[PDB]
From a paper:
pmcThe human macrophage migration inhibitory factor (MIF) superfamily, comprised of MIF and D-dopachrome tautomerase (DDT, also called MIF-2), is broadly and constitutively expressed with involvement in proinflammatory and host antimicrobial responses. MIF and MIF-2 are highly similar in structure, with monomeric units of 114 and 117 amino acids, respectively, that form homotrimers. An evolutionarily conserved proline at the N terminus acts as the catalytic base for a tautomerization reaction of unknown biological significance in both proteins. The same site in MIF-2 is Phe100 and is also evolutionarily conserved among all MIF-2 proteins, suggesting this site plays an important role in both proteins.
The MIF-2 S62A variant was made to test this serine as a transmission conduit between Phe100 and Pro1 in MIF-2, equivalent to His62 bridging Tyr99 and Pro1 in MIF. The loss in enzymatic activity of MIF-2 S62A (13%) is qualitatively similar to that of MIF H62A (25%), relative to the activities of their respective wt proteins. Ser62 and His62 are not part of the active sites, with side chains that point into the solvent cavity or channel, respectively, and are not expected to cause any enzymatic activity loss unless each residue is involved in the transmission pathway between the allosteric and active sites. It must be noted that Ser62 interacts with Phe2, adjacent to Pro1, meaning the impact of the S62A mutation on catalysis could in part be due to loss of communication between Ser62 and Phe2 that propagates to Pro1. However, the crystal structure of S62A MIF-2 shows no evidence of alteration to the Phe2 side chain relative to that of wt-MIF-2, suggesting this factor may not have a large influence. Crystal structures of MIF variants and substrate- or inhibitor-bound complexes typically display very few differences, and consistent with this trend, the P1G and S62A variants have RMSD values of 0.30 Å and 0.32 Å with the wt-MIF-2 trimer, respectively. However, the catalytically active S62A shows a water network slightly less dense than wt-MIF-2/P1G, correlating with its modestly attenuated activity. The S62A variant displayed the weakest structural and dynamic perturbations. Consistent with its modest effect on MIF-2 chemical shifts and enzymatic activity, S62A displays R1R2 parameters that deviate least from wt-MIF-2. While the inflammatory cellular response was modestly impacted by S62A administration, it did decrease alveolar–capillary leak in the murine model, when compared with wt-MIF2.
Numbering used by the authors:
A (entry chain A), B (entry chain C), C (entry chain B): 1 to 117
The structure:
């Protein structure tokens, strides 16, 4: 999984280690070993979410296999909202998630692609 | 809609409130209520556009329904180029846009997905 | 091509001119004119890669035509891994790549889309 979190919280208002705890949570939620999980956090950005510039965060989740249906993603969404609202001290209206299926031929690892690993 | 703007203009050379004006413009251009529009601006990056590191901006637009054909995207592109050239004091040659269709099952909102809202 | 590189290396640990050298390398590797190549570098981020927050980098490569098969991307991966490991002073285990095919109707340029140019 590849997670990318953009936020207009300044870095010093994002709890230390958030990227590590989100990595562990994503592994658990998505059913993947942590050594397959990736998290990128980009703080201090200028953002509007749902038309408003109050503190907010956007999460993108891309993965092989597990983020391709509405029913699967509904389940994931509830768990990721629970995690992020509490960590970031944000209301549920200040977070949105986008889900993106990936296939093995798209993922470059150790100088090849996952199709050949 | 989810708009993401990357620029090598330093933050202090990006007009104040650009994220608000781009949110309002995107609502009008794309035909969506502003409370459904999201904008993220990432300034101060190191960028080449068309092989050149002169000041530039990259805009990504992901939306349900309205960004899936060449004719639709041509219509949006004209308006977004007009808006961004004037805001950023950039020529049309220093801006590129990428359009990405989304579907409801990909959008996590209030702990579910838009398929069920 | 559109290349986007996220890294938790601080900006002052990313060698000067990396975006220029990556632009030139991408033109050669992907077989595209340099004036069609775009590169964005986002340093100083908070990142976990494969569950570890040691220095790392994530590269996304989006392009018309040339990043759509496992066999093409296997070759591109080897070349881009060779480039990024040496430029960033990172081991092969600290970089991943994602490949994203684009089509001409998705690329906004001079107020239209590339379908019409």
């Amino acid at each position: 999984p590849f997670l990318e979190l953009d936020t207009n919280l300044p870095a010093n208002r994002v709890p230390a280690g958030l990227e590590k705890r989100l990595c562990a949570a994503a592994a658990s939620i998505l059913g993947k070993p942590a050594d397959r999980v990736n998290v990128t956090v980009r703080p201090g950005l200028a953002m509007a979410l749902s038309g408003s510039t109050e503190p907010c965060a956007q999460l993108s989740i891309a993965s092989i296999g597990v983020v391709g249906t509405a029913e699967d993603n509904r389940s994931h969404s509830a768990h990721f909202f629970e995690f992020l609202t509490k960590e970031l001290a944000l209301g549920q209206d200040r977070i949105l998630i986008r889900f993106f299926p990936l296939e093995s031929w798209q993922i470059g690892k150790i100088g090849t692609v996952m199709t050949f690993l």
